[PDB]
Each structure stands twice: as structure tokens, then as C-alpha cells.
Amino acid sequence: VHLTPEEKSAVTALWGKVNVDEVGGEALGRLLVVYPWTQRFFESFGDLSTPDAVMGNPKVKAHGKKVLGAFSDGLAHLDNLKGTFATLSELHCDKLHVDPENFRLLGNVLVCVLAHHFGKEFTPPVQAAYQKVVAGVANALAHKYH
């Protein structure tokens, strides 16, 4: 529906090469230092003042594993994205009150992180499919908001 079968193959292929342990910590650490208004939500994770502390903090790295796994879980079936993220969207809307833009910002940083880790293999058609995936996830986690 959303993606062509050739587009789906490449997206699923690259997601195999990823190192879930380190990619999640990388993207979360970058967002907390590039856009430094998300440090407010992660005050439970300790010191986050300096970029090296943000990268070296164990808690954000562990939270990166949770973020990455949920992204992989969302990739399981695209039409279910409304129902897949309905449980998580409520947490981000009623308890933490995370603005929908931060979902779009984290996804954009994820594309940059994946491009940094891979290199030339981040073919422009490949990133186009990834952006379409990211846009849906940001919309799906925000569609709960009303």
C-alpha cells in the first residue's frame, strides 16, 4: 500500500546490518545535543550537560534500545501502525506530553545516523523510502493526539 515491493526489500535489508545496541544510543545522544530542549524529558537519566556525558550516559543508551526496537516493531506491518503505536502514543501524549514535532525530529536524526554508519550504501532512493517510513511513524505516534 504505502511502499513498493522493491522499496520494502531494501529497507528490510539494511535493518539487518544495524547494531541495535549502539545505533539507538547514537541517535538519542545526537538529538539531546543538537536540539537541547529534550533534556527536560530525560531528567531521570542523570547528567546531560556536556555532549560526552550525553553519549556516555548508560541510561540514554538503554533507552535507545527501546526506541530502536519499537521502530523495528512498527516495521512489521504498516497498516497496523495505528494499532501498533496506540499503546505507546498514549504514554507520550497523556503522561510525558511529547510534542509531535519531536517525533519528526528524532526520525530525521535517525536518517542522518544511519547515513553516517553506512556511507555510500545510503543510496538516495533508499533514504527516500526511509523518510516515507519515518513520516508515517511520526504521524502514527501523533494521531493519538487530539
Partner: protein, 289 residues
């Protein structure tokens, strides 16, 4: 400062049951007499409001028209039921809220939630599915949405429900349940040369359907091939020797580890309640063909 967990402690003091939510201004009745607690906030850990923290003791800041009132779930005329199924233990779930019967949204429905509903209704919970069978979409207000339950609870009202009357989900999808003893479930292969090769046909409570090809693969195919006693699975297609009939109900599979003994042990398999027009029927050819 009235809270939902604050209301939970309140209805526990009456010992009747859980409350649907916290309500303000006492819309049902007018207050009377002096009041002792104002702007009351409670964490919910405390057994009673008396152990709960009070902003003021022996006084009230809200007037009798603004003072809160409590509406309780057990006091509300709530009763779960099943409508339009193959038997009395299958079909679309219904919740009577405020005297109006409504369905349950599909989003958030899990095998744990199906286990609770089967226990609540009264027929055995040996095998529980998360889909509605042979039923059509209902009309009314969807009173429950994103019902997330641990499974070991007496009723779904005590389970954490998002909100009464959210109705966010479309009325086409409604949560259903299939409470089965485990004897009626049967799986067979039809339309091929041998019993081990053909189209996967399921028969649950004497209702014949197929298996959708959403996540069907070789790994999920070993479960079926082993279950029929026909070795492992080689090919997802087969050679047609006869024409199978046409069925309207479909079984949907989430995921399987591949080491399961039977297809029924795979986690979160939905029976009916959905259509996959783009996808085709799932087929399989066992090695013992």
C-alpha cells in the same frame, strides 16, 4: 485536584468495585452538610483517603455545586456479552455503558485481554483468540479503546482501560473473542494430491475458513506441517488436483518462533474479524507429500 486513582481509592472504601473515572461538580446530586477535605489529591497507594494527603483538614474551598461526585463502575449497569457468533462463546464483544450497548475497539486487544473476557463470561479459557467470528460491525458508541490487561484479573473493568467513550477507532473494527475448550479446533489441507499438500483450511467450532498470506512463510509453515504429522515444509505452493470451496472467514497469524508443536500455540492468532483482499490464501506443501 480530583484524580482517577483518587476516585479508585474512593470506590474501594465503599467496597463496591472500581470506578469508571473521577467526576467533578457532583452532577448527579447536590452536596449537603459541612465538608472536611478541599482540593483533595491522592496517590492511590494509600488504602483510604484518610491516609491520603489532604490539602485542608476540616474545611472545603469548593462550594456545594463545585464539590466533586463519584460515579462507580459496579454501580453503572455494565455487563459483558457476546453477540452474533458461531456459538455463545464466539462473536463480537459488547459493553453496556450508561444503559447503551457498545462494542470494544480492536486496537490494544491482546491474548491476555481475550483470556480475561473468557473467564468473565463463563465458558472455558483453554484456547482464546483475539478476533470476532462471523460477526458484523455493530452500531453505537465504542465505550472501550486500547484495553491493556495483564491477564490475571477477574474483570476487564478492573483492567486498565484508556477512557470510557473515547470512540477514536472506526466502527468497522470491533474486538471479538473465541473461547474454546480445545476440542473443536482442527486443521486440514485440501485441494492437493495428498493430505500433506494443499491450501490450509481451518475449522474452528465447525466454521470453515482459510489462512491469510500476510506473514505466511517457510518458518511459520513448519508448525503446520509438523502439526499434521507430515514432516517439514518445502514449498509455499502446490499442484492443484481439485477445486476447493469458497470461504469468507480468515485466520490471521502474528508471528511464530518455528519450534511450536501446534498452530494454536503461536502467540496472538486472530480468528475472523478482518479481511485481506490484496493477499491470497496461504498454501503449503509438506515434505511427506
Amino acid at each position: 485536584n480530583f484524580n482517577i486513582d483518587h476516585a479508585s481509592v474512593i470506590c474501594r472504601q465503599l467496597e463496591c468495585g472500581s470506578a469508571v473515572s473521577f467526576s467533578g461538580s457532583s452532577n448527579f446530586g447536590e452536596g449537603s452538610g459541612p465538608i472536611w477535605f478541599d482540593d483533595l489529591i491522592c496517590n492511590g497507594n494509600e488504602s483510604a483517603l484518610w491516609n491520603c494527603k489532604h490539602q485542608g483538614w476540616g474545611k472545603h474551598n469548593c462550594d456545594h455545586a463545585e464539590d466533586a461526585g463519584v460515579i462507580c463502575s459496579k454501580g453503572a449497569d455494565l455487563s459483558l456479552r457476546l453477540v452474533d457468533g458461531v456459538t455463545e462463546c464466539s462473536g463480537r464483544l459488547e459493553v453496556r455503558f450508561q444503559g447503551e450497548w457498545g462494542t470494544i475497539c480492536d486496537d490494544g486487544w491482546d491474548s491476555y485481554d481475550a483470556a480475561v473476557a473468557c473467564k468473565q463470561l463463563g465458558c472455558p479459557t483453554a484456547v482464546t483468540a483475539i478476533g470476532r467470528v462471523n460477526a458484523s460491525k455493530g452500531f453505537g458508541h465504542i465505550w472501550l479503546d486500547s484495553v491493556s490487561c495483564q491477564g490475571h484479573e477477574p474483570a476487564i473493568w478492573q483492567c486498565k482501560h484508556h477512557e470510557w467513550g473515547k470512540h477514536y477507532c472506526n466502527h468497522n473494527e470491533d474486538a471479538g473473542v473465541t473461547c474454546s475448550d480445545g476440542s473443536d479446533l482442527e486443521l486440514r489441507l485440501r485441494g492437493g494430491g495428498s493430505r500433506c499438500a494443499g491450501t490450509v483450511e481451518v475449522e474452528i467450532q465447525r466454521l470453515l475458513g482459510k489462512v491469510c498470506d500476510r506473514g505466511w512463510g517457510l518458518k511459520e509453515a513448519d508448525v503446520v506441517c509438523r502439526q499434521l504429522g507430515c514432516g517439514s515444509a518445502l514449498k509455499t505452493s502446490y499442484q492443484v488436483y481439485s477445486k476447493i470451496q469458497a470461504t469468507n472467514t480468515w485466520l490471521f497469524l502474528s508471528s511464530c518462533n518455528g519450534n511450536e508443536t501446534s498452530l494454536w500455540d503461536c502467540k496472538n492468532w486472530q480468528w475472523g474479524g478482518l479481511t485481506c483482499d490484496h493477499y491470497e490464501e496461504a498454501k503449503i506443501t509438506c515434505s511427506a507429500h
